[PDB]
């Protein structure tokens, strides 16, 4: 509720229609607004169209934002969640007034689940850090995923040091660093270019060594 | 000369059917043997079977080997160089007497041309050598190609120093070499796993640099 209460207070700016995919066979798009009298999904229409396909309308939903705002959303049925094609989105108010218009590529808006199984180890024979882990569970195209390692801790030093990682890789030997240092590590997953694109996942559960 | 004559005195294994692809829409297969009074390409039949396509024939050619042995080859027709299906191969004497039978995958038998435009430079700012090159000319799927860098040094100074470059990379910066030394560098390419497989290419024409 510290991390929790930080969010209620960490104010963002303007509204935007935000879309993302977790595996590559789903698509969720939403927006959020001020809670207002009997304004439910029935006052909006969310229309999509895969390039060269009949126009389609999906079901809008509503749920509250942890901040008291409302969130409206649609989930495209897998069958239409194809990559490598221009997806046009249209959110309109029932008065005829246009709320949002966007064109996206589902393959460029990926937001993977974070990596599991983080294990750290002292490469005993050399004396150091051997970093291994697992990709986002139940996610395909494993050999496309780029990684990011976040080394840190060691009192007063605010080392939040990060090292990139090439795709399909799930091991990194933090070879050279310190003696008798508390160290905590975590890592993010991201679909790699140039086929895919997207957003940095949440950090994977940390692991702490103590040199 | 030297490499040729050295080549000429080398060892030898038995008869073996040899196939390879260069770009990904071609296949060459061949086998060598001893010269013969009255034996030509018309003495054997070379047939193939691309899974669930009917048996077909490829016409043999015959070429002399520098060593005095004869070479039978044939290059498959374009519409038959498909990549992820089993290719049935069979060479038979002109009397139905059996000679060869192999089964392959054109994607697992890549033998690319050598890299080009290799240049060496001294990174003024840091004192580092930076090597650059291009992929084999007219080769598709270039971000899947891996490269190996050979570093061979001056006079009596040469320990064997090679460098692995990851797929897609066509540059490399060699740090940590001796001063006033002559360094000659050269590259060679290979289709990476697990999609394609094959053989390392020939080296590229090299560049030499006085540190």
């Amino acid at each position: 509720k510290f991390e929790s209460k930080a969010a209620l207070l960490a104010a963002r700016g303007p509204e935007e229609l935000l879309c993302f995919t977790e595996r590559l066979e789903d698509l969720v798009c939403f927006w959020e607004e001020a809670a207002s009298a009997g304004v439910g999904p029935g006052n909006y229409s969310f229309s999509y169209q895969l390039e060269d396909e009949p126009w389609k309308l999906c079901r809008l939903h509503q749920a509250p934002t942890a901040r008291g705002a409302v969130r409206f959303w649609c989930s495209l049925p897998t069958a239409d969640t194809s990559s490598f094609v221009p997806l046009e989105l249209r959110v309109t108010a029932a008065s005829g007034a246009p709320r949002y218009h966007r064109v996206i590529h589902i393959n460029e808006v990926v937001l993977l689940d974070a990596p599991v199984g983080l294990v750290a180890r002292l490469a005993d024979e050399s004396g150091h850090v051997v970093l291994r882990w697992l990709p986002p569970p139940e996610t395909p195209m494993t050999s496309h995923i780029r990684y990011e390692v976040d080394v840190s801790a060691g009192n007063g030093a605010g080392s939040v040091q990060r090292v990139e990682i090439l795709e399909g890789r799930t091991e990194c030997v933090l070879s050279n660093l310190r003696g008798r240092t508390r160290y905590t590590f975590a890592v993010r997953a991201r679909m790699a270019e140039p086929s895919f694109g997207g957003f940095w996942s949440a950090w994977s559960e940390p692991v702490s060594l103590l040199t | 000369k030297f490499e040729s004559k050295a080549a000429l005195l080398a060892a030898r294994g038995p008869e073996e059917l040899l196939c390879f692809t260069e770009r990904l829409e071609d296949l060459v297969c061949f086998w060598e043997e001893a010269a013969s009074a009255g034996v030509g390409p018309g003495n054997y039949s070379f047939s193939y079977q691309l899974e669930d396509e009917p048996w077909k024939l490829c016409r043999l050619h015959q070429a002399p080997t520098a060593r005095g042995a004869v070479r039978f080859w044939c290059s498959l027709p374009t519409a038959d160089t498909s990549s992820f299906v089993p290719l049935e191969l069979r060479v038979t004497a002109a009397s139905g007497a059996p000679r060869y039978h192999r089964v392959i995958h054109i994607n697992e038998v890549v033998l690319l041309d050598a890299p080009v435009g290799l240049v060496a430079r001294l990174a003024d700012e840091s004192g580092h050598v930076v090597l650059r090159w291009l992929p084999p000319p007219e080769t598709p799927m270039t971000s899947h190609i891996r490269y190996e860098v050979d570093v061979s040094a001056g006079n009596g100074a040469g320990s064997v120093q090679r460098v692995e470059i990851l797929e897609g990379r066509t540059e490399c910066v060699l740090s940590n070499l001796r001063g006033r030394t002559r360094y000659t560098f050269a590259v060679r390419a290979r289709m990476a796993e697990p999609s394609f497989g094959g053989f390392w290419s020939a080296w590229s024409e090299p560049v030499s640099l006085l540190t």
Binding site: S83 | P140, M141
Partner: peptide, 16 residues
Amino acid sequence: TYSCHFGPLTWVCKPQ
């Protein structure tokens, strides 16, 4: 699912 061919860099796909 998709229809692909070898491009100069990597696969050029498209939904079948």
